[PDB]
């Protein structure tokens, strides 16, 4: 059985570096090119770069060529990837991919491994729930959980589609001028809470939570409230 | 009367420059902080930069800090985001809000503007119809990969099942892979590619993909969601 075993992602800072590796067993790593395919989270499948031993050929994405580096040991059947100037953007899973024999003149990616999750973040607000569908005149009540202790530095938004960002609900609780009082806020510390009493058309849209207290003032998710 | 206005936004190829413009009235531009705030394509909210023309200070999210650059021009009463080095991530709505005056602890954006719409995209291409579908057991699915360039049947298909590795399916178009089921079929030439699921099973419920097989970047389709 043809198997290939990618390792090395994890949890890294901005500008830091990662080494992918890719073991291959069940055939011979020579003669076969090996290929880096990426999935950001919620995206489709992007080509990174490509390697075949026995002909000495490496290639590139374009968008990598400077800062990624592809490479092999043949002893070990491993293939590698180095990543340098890591950014937020290069947060995905990361998979390699068998490609053609080097005898051969046909490139599918016919053998692929499990993934390995790499990401790149500073480490706040986990908004709930995600979506949720209400009818009218229903109450609703949306969570906002913070990572840290906020007081009660948290703010509220609404956005209908199409639309900018409205403010709600400032310092947790406070109701901001020409909202409606159908509206309440509450909690402090990490638990914080908006509650509709009663939902009206106007209502269907996407809620956020937001730290207010320092940079970079996190957004939570959002929760989108859809009608049933 | 306090209004913002957002312009400068466009469609750029990546690697290019936009100068956003936030146009602020009906209030003491100099005394409060102006921010800018964007939102990529169905997704949340996210803090840019800050400016503060009275206490002298500005703030960037570590994101953009040495892309991203904020001023103002007090004669004007608006603030400016030039962004330099864009990248397809960067496409996103971008508005700026005013959060709290120069002596205020708190943070929270209290007037927003429209937004302007910032693309990021070259404007080789790989489009896949329909982007998702509902079906039943049993049913036919019909996808459609659609190439802005000849091929010469140099397509394959790929299955990734939820979290999981993509697996080939069908390679130089027709070709079906060893071990792949039957029920499955590619065909199709030139520009134009398509594939049949004849009798859909609770194991085919995935994201498929069409490929360029040759030459790099091995572009791949957006994806067809398959679900029940």
């Known amino acids: 059985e043809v198997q290939l075993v990618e390792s090395g992602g994890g949890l890294v800072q901005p500008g830091g570096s990662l080494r992918l590796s890719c073991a291959a067993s069940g055939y011979s790593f020579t003669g076969y090119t090996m290929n880096w395919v990426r999935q950001a989270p919620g995206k489709g499948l992007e080509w990174v770069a490509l390697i075949n031993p026995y002909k000495g050929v490496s290639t590139y994405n374009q968008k990598f060529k400077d800062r990624f580096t592809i490479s092999v040991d043949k002893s070990k059947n491993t293939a590698y990837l180095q990543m340098n100037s890591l950014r937020a953007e290069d947060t995905a899973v990361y998979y390699c991919?068998?490609?053609?024999?080097?005898?051969?003149?046909?490139?599918?990616?016919?053998?692929w491994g499990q993934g390995t999750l790499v990401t790149v973040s500073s480490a706040q607000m986990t908004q709930s729930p995600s979506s949720l569908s209400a009818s009218v005149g229903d109450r609703v009540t949306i969570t906002c959980?913070?990572?840290?202790?906020?007081?009660?530095?948290?703010?509220?938004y609404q956005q209908k589609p199409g639309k900018a960002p409205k403010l709600?609900?400032?310092?947790?609780?406070?109701?901001?001028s020409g909202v409606p009082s159908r509206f309440s806020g509450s909690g402090s510390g990490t638990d914080f809470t908006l509650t509709i009493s009663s939902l009206q058309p106007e209502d269907f849209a996407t809620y956020y939570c937001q730290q207010s207290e320092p940079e970079p003032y996190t957004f939570g998710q959002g929760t989108k409230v859809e009608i049933k | 009367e306090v209004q913002l206005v957002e312009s400068g936004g466009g469609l750029v190829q990546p690697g290019g420059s936009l100068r956003l413009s936030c146009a602020a009235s009906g209030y003491s531009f100099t005394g409060y902080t102006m921010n800018w705030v964007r939102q990529a394509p169905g997704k949340g909210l996210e803090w840019v930069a800050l400016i503060n023309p009275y206490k002298g200070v500005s703030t960037y999210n570590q994101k953009f800090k040495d892309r991203f650059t904020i001023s103002v021009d007090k004669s004007k009463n608006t603030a400016y985001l030039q962004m330099n080095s864009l990248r397809a991530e960067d496409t996103a709505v971008?508005?700026?809000?005013?959060?709290?005056?120069?002596?205020?602890?708190?943070?929270?954006?209290?007037?927003?503007?429209?937004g302007t719409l910032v693309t990021v995209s070259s404007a080789i291409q790989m489009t896949q119809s329909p982007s998702s579908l509902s079906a039943s057991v049993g049913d036919r699915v019909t996808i459609t990969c659609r190439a802005s360039?000849?091929?010469?049947?140099?397509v394959a298909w790929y299955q990734q099942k939820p979290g999981k590795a993509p697996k080939l399916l069908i390679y130089?178009?027709?070709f079906l892979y060893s071990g792949v089921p039957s029920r499955f079929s590619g065909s199709g030439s030139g520009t134009d590619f398509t594939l049949t699921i004849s009798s859909l099973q609770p194991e085919d419920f995935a994201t498929y993909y069409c490929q360029q097989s040759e030459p790099e970047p091995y572009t791949f389709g957006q994806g067809t969601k398959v679900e029940i």
């Open positions: 360039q000849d091929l010469a049947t140099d």
């Open positions: 991919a068998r490609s053609g024999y080097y005898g051969d003149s046909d490139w599918y990616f016919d053998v």
């Open positions: 130089s178009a027709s």
